[PDB]
Amino acid sequence: VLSEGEWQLVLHVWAKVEADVAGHGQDILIRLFKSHPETLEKFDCFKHLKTEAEMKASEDLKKAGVTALTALGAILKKKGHHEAELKPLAQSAATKAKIPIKYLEFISEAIIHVLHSRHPGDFGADAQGAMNKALELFRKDIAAKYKELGYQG
């Protein structure tokens, strides 16, 4: 459970993400693929990307980071009351991605790393705990929609 104070920590640092969504998205996806290079194989649209330099120069990767953070930010702003926004996203993910759902845990760690790296003054221990809870709630609710239809179950 997030307190309302914790939701406000989440939204306060998210405002800093929104000041440079593309840059945060590049940093997060590159961190994901350096920490878990085994995940890159499952991103069909990145089949041409192998090196950090190639990822930093990729418009496909930059656009994908923007799309991911755009949808994540819209869900975070609902402060847990995200059924209407989450259900179509999760059900489409379940029937169109066949990217393992455990990869959401890896990208969550990448988000926390990047936010701490870029915004330490606004991402201390309390804000990191709040963001960790918010992304865990998101992942659990996505898994719930997957399990409804039987995917990743």
Side-chain angles (χ1 to χ4, degrees), residues 60-72:
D60 285 305
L61 189 141
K62 177 196 269 193
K63 284 175 109 210
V66 170
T67 299
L69 291 180
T70 298
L72 177 56

Side-chain angles (χ1 to χ4, degrees), residues 1-7 10 129-131 133-135 137:
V1 202
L2 282 87
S3 66
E4 173 65 18
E6 287 181 297
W7 280 115
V10 166
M131 180 69 66
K133 295 205 242 165
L135 302 180
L137 172 64

Side-chain angles (χ1 to χ4, degrees), residues 44-105:
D44 186 73
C45 63
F46 300 157
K47 62 160 93 56
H48 62 299
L49 305 177
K50 294 109 192 174
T51 72
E52 184 168 3
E54 288 169 341
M55 315 171 156
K56 302 206 163 113
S58 173
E59 185 74 22
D60 285 305
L61 189 141
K62 177 196 269 193
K63 284 175 109 210
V66 170
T67 299
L69 291 180
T70 298
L72 177 56
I75 288 173
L76 291 179
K77 288 173 175 176
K78 299 310 299 299
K79 303 190 290 179
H81 298 299
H82 52 229
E83 167 79 2
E85 292 89 352
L86 187 144
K87 179 203 166 197
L89 182 65
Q91 290 191 3
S92 201
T95 57
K96 294 175 36 133
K98 295 298 182 182
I99 308 206
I101 215 180
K102 85 199 164 165
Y103 289 9
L104 302 185
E105 179 187 345

Side-chain angles (χ1 to χ4, degrees), residues 9-20 24 77 119:
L9 293 178
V10 166
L11 298 182
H12 186 251
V13 67
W14 208 257
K16 295 167 163 43
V17 173
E18 290 182 337
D20 181 18
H24 283 83
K77 288 173 175 176
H119 311 292

